[PDB]
Each structure stands twice: as C-alpha cells, then as structure tokens.
Amino acid sequence: HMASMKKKGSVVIVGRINLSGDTAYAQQTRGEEGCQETSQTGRDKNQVEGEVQIVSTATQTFLATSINGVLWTVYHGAGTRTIASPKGPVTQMYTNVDKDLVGWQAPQGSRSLTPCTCGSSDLYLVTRHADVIPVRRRGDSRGSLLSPRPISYLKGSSGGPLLCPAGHAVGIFRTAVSTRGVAKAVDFIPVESLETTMR
Ligand SMILES: CCC[C@H](NC(=O)[C@@H]1[C@H]2CCC[C@H]2CN1C(=O)[C@@H](NC(=O)[C@@H](NC(=O)c1cnccn1)C1CCCCC1)C(C)(C)C)[C@@H](O)C(=O)NC1CC1
Ligand SMILES: [Zn+2]
C-alpha cells in the first residue's frame, strides 16, 4: 500500500516549433515510447534548441516557451511536475496556480524570447502545429482572433507564445474563449506578470 505508491512522471520535451527562418514548422524530437521512458526516469539527454518546446505528460501534450532564461508553461498542463533533463528531473523554479503559470530553468541549448516593451496591440499566436495566427489585443490578458477557428485548432497550444510585430514575447497562451465550439478570442498570461514573478 505505502510500498505501491507511484510518483507522477516528469514533463518531457518531445519537439519544438521552429521559428528560426522564413517558415514556422513543428519538429518532433522524441516518439511516444521514448517519451514514456523519459517521463519515468526524468533523464533526457536529447539536445534542446529554440524558443518554443513541445512538451508532454502521460496524458497531455502542450507547449512551453523560454523567456528571460526560464521555460514557462501552464499549471493546468504541468501541475507541479519536474521536467526531464540530462542530469535527471529538475524541480520547478516558479509555481503559481493563481496565474496558471509554472517555470523551470531554461534547458541548456534553448534560446529565450525577450519581453515586449513596445506596447503594440497587433499580436501573433504560435500554435502547436506551427500556425502563426493574428490576434488583436483586447485587454491586459485577452485578444481576439482575426479569423475564428474551431477550438480543436488551439487544443494543445497552451503554454505557447503571443508575439508582437518585432517578435518579442507579449504573453503565454492560457485558454481559448469559445462559443458553441468556435474560438473567437484567447486568454493569456501577460509577460509583465512573468516579469513580476521573476523580479
Ligand atoms: C483552450 C485551448 C488550450 C487549452 N486550454 C484549456 O484547456 C483551458 C484550461 C484552463 C483551465 C480549464 C481548462 C479549460 N480551458 C479552456 O480553454 C476552455 N475555455 C473555457 O472554458 C472558457 N469558457 C467558455 O468558452 C464558455 C463559457 N460559458 C459558456 C460556454 N462556454 C473560459 C471563459 C472564461 C475565461 C477562460 C476561458 C475550453 C476552450 C477548452 C472549453 C490547453 O490546456 C491545451 O493546450 N489543451 C490541450 C491538451 C488538450
Ligand atoms: Zn514588442
């Protein structure tokens, strides 16, 4: 009974959204069997690159975004889980259920986005399928899609970035705002909220 007590696995990086060139595209770096093993050991020796990682638990796949040397994602996806790394599991450096926000030290090899300082309300959401979707900022933590999509389109994009025209991080996508299955808007965690969390 106490001896049969299992532990939750680590979050595992299973790919990335490549934003380095003219074309955004998703790359897978680990398959399902490797993911399952790595989640249990917490030992991930794969090379990490890029700003936006595709991450998985046993039950969910979603995104994580590096900003100012922290890999950030949503609490509703990651919970309090460690992330797998070459040295074994790494404990969260930030955990905030009230903001729906968690973060780990950014993996060696990752690149970070810089927080936006320009005040622009013309944003771009990067999805787990590497779509770059225009979003008009409508408040501190909400934006509207210029073209509404079924919510399926956004499933698994939580933890991904909203970017300004200059490619700086404005926020982390948290949840879709939907009506009868159509997403018309998105809620996000503003980068200023991350910056406060960091000090
Ligand atoms: C929504 C797309 C991204 C996913 N976000 C989520 O799953 C978040 C989580 C936040 C905590 C509760 C969950 C519900 N959720 C939602 O976005 C859900 N949105 C909602 O439930 C939104 N509510 C509504 O759309 C609504 C409200 N009244 C009546 C009818 N519909 C609320 C509205 C208030 C602000 C917050 C959003 C949705 C779209 C799935 C039904 C993300 O978790 C993800 O990447 N998923 C993949 C693994 C399956
Ligand atoms: Zn900016």
Side-chain angles (χ1 to χ4, degrees), residues 121 123 125 134-146 154 162 173 175-177 183 185-188:
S121 284
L123 312 179
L125 169 71
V135 172
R136 174 68 185 182
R137 202 184 185 154
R138 298 296 190 187
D140 56 4
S141 65
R142 183 158 297 187
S144 59
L145 298 184
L146 277 56
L154 302 180
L162 285 89
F173 176 50
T175 69
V177 184
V186 291
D187 283 325
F188 63 89

Side-chain angles (χ1 to χ4, degrees), residues 116-118 164 168:
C116 178
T117 60
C118 74
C164 77
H168 304 137

